[PDB]
């Protein structure tokens, strides 16, 4: 592992960040002082959920809660393939992270994000309560249930 960390090959270190992510070694990746890994995540954060989650962990441990709430909220409003329940977790985290002070950011900007995440989380829970009840309902034909699961187990719908 010395030979690994003693390298200056950049495509290599990118390939190793991806490999650590694959194997699940949050142990070793979260323990890198470097910003090089943060910058690498900032480009692909809004591309994949698993990468965004890593980026948000780096922000939170650095008391940058508002920036994580921003990543999580945009991810919940996006058209990436994300389940409704995963979008409930993202909003719930963003709601908490925007409710606490982050230095350098105005109280107004925090509250406006904490409010957008609170409303979207309220709608998401309604949608989750619906989807669950509809799937379990004995009086609903199977043919329709599959159709319900397609349109409700994804991005959050209007009221």
């Amino acid at each position: 592992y010395n030979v690994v960390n003693d390298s200056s090959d950049e495509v290599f270190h990118f390939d190793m960040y991806e490999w650590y992510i694959e194997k699940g070694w949050t142990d070793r990746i979260l323990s890198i002082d470097s910003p090089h890994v943060i910058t690498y995540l900032q480009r692909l954060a809004e591309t994949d959920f698993r990468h965004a989650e890593l980026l948000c962990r780096f922000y939170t441990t650095r008391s940058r809660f508002f920036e994580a709430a921003q990543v999580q909220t945009n991810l919940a409003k996006s058209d990436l393939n994300i389940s409704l329940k995963d979008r409930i977790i993202l909003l719930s985290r963003a709601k908490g992270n925007a409710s606490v002070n982050t230095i350098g950011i105005s109280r107004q900007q925090q509250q406006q994000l904490n409010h957008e995440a609170s409303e979207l989380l309220e709608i998401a829970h309604i949608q989750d309560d619906l989807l669950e009840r509809l799937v379990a309902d004995p009086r609903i034909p199977e043919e329709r249930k599959a159709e319900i699961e397609e349109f409700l187990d994804g991005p959050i719908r209007t009221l």
């Binding site: 609903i140 034909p141 043919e143 329709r144 159709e147």
Partner: peptide
């Protein structure tokens, strides 16, 4: 923003196509 429209929906109790 909510807008009720009972007019044209999709029969929740009938399959598609």
């Amino acid at each position: 923003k909510l807008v009720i429209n009972k007019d044209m929906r999709t029969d929740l109790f009938s399959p598609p196509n």
